[PDB]
Every structure is written in structure tokens, then in C-alpha cells.
Sequence to fold (294 residues):
Amino acid sequence: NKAEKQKRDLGEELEALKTELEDTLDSTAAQQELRSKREQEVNILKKTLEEEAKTHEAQIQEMRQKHSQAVEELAEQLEQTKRVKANLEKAKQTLENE
Amino acid sequence: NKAEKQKRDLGEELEALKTELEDTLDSTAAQQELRSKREQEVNILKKTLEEEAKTHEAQIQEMRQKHSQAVEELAEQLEQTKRVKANLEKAKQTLENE
Amino acid sequence: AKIAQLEEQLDNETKERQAACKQVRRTEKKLKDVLLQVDDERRNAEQYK
Amino acid sequence: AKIAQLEEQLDNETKERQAACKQVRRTEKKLKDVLLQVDDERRNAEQYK
Fold:
């Protein structure tokens, strides 16, 4: 899926480069605002990317705690079931001993 | 394999346009330095984002195996207790009859 | 006696299948290596075009 | 009972050995096509070169 999405990005970059080349005549005077605007947009993208990476770390922590809680709950049930099995086995020994 | 082949073919289109414009890149050294640095920064972001996504994705894969193995180990012991309960139930009916 | 001859045939037939599987996996690796050469050959023709 | 299980296992092993037989020819046929495909790509690069 990432390869298919990457193919669209490569094709879009080729079309953008072709249109940007023809706009070289107007880029000489438009760089005064595009430089400050493009730089600000890059900073906004970095903040969004950092937030996405931070959100993934928080989700991983929840999964580690959720998965660990499930294993911990199952472990407690094993101890209770194992302890109950000892009572059943001990009760059977009483019948055989009697 | 076909997707990777198409990616390499698409990349050749960008190199073809760059070679045809190399004659003008030298004359435009006043702004080519700043534009060239921006292109390298975009490539580093893709590699860092791809490496971060691949590294983060590996963490989820480990959880699907480490946590699953723990649940499978605990589940195996639980199933063993259920089978032992069936055998113990038959002993009670036989011991009570004797 | 039939079980003895049948068990021996199963082991011999099973061993033959394992040998064929090894040759299949071996030829697959060679095909993948030769398949990669197509990209290198096509890349040269593409770069020359 | 042992003859029934042994006969079923022996029959299944021989079928996977038509399975292994046809699989070997499939990989060999595909390998030959890859060898000729890379050869055609090599000639294409020479023509463009």
C-alpha cells in the first residue's frame, strides 16, 4: 500500500516540477513571499509530524499496558485455577485413603 | 517486484529532466545552493519518517508475538486443568460407588 | 508383512518428496537471482534510451 | 486399522511426490522463460546503446 501511495507522490512531484519550471519568470518577484510562506508551512508540517510520532508512542504505551494487563489477569486466573486443582486432587486422595 | 520496478522507472524521469537542466543549474548558483539544500532535507525526512515508521511498526510486531506467546502459555495451562477436571470427575463417581 | 513393506515405501516416498522440495527451492533462488538481472539489463536499456 | 491408516498415508505421499513432480516442471519452465527474458532485455540495451 505504501508503494502505491509513493507512486502517486512521485507522479505529482514530476507534474509540480514541470509547472514550477514554467513559472521561473514569475518566481523572481514571488520569492519574497513564497520563501517566508514555504518556510512557515514546513514548520507547521514538522509540528504535525512530531505530534503524530508522539501520538504513536502514547498508543504503544496503551497497548503495552493493555496487553500486559490481559496477561496479568490471565496469570491470576491460572493461580486460582491451579490452587483449586490442588483442592480437587487433595479431595480425591481422601476418598482413596478412606 | 513490479511496483519496485515502476518506482525505479519513475525515478529515471526525474533524473532525465535534471540532466537536461544541468546547463542552467550552474548559472543559477545564487539560488541553486538554497534550493539544493532543501531537496536534501526532504530526502532526509522521508528516510527518517520511513525508518521511524518501520522501527515503530516493529514494536507492534513484537507485541503480537511476545504478548501472544504469554497468553498462549497461560492458555495452555488452563486447558490442561480442564482436562484434569474431567478425569477427576470420573474418579468421584467410581470412588463413591465403591 | 504388508505393514512392514508399506512403512518402508512411505519412508522412501517421503524422502523423495523432500529431495524434490529442495530442488524446487534451489531453482527458485536461481530464478530470483536471474530475475534481478532483468532489472539491471532493463535499467541499462532505459538509461541508454 | 493400521493398514487403513498406512494405505491412506502412502497414497497421500505419492500424490504430493504428482504435486512435487508438476511443481518441479513449473519452476523449470519459469526459469527458462526468465533466462530468455533477461537475454532479450540485454539485446534491447545494446540496440539503444
Observations:
- The longest helix of chain C spans residues 2-48.
- The interface with chain B takes residues 35, 39, 42-43, 46-47 of chain C (CB under 8 Å).
- The two ends of chain C are 72 Å apart (CA to CA).
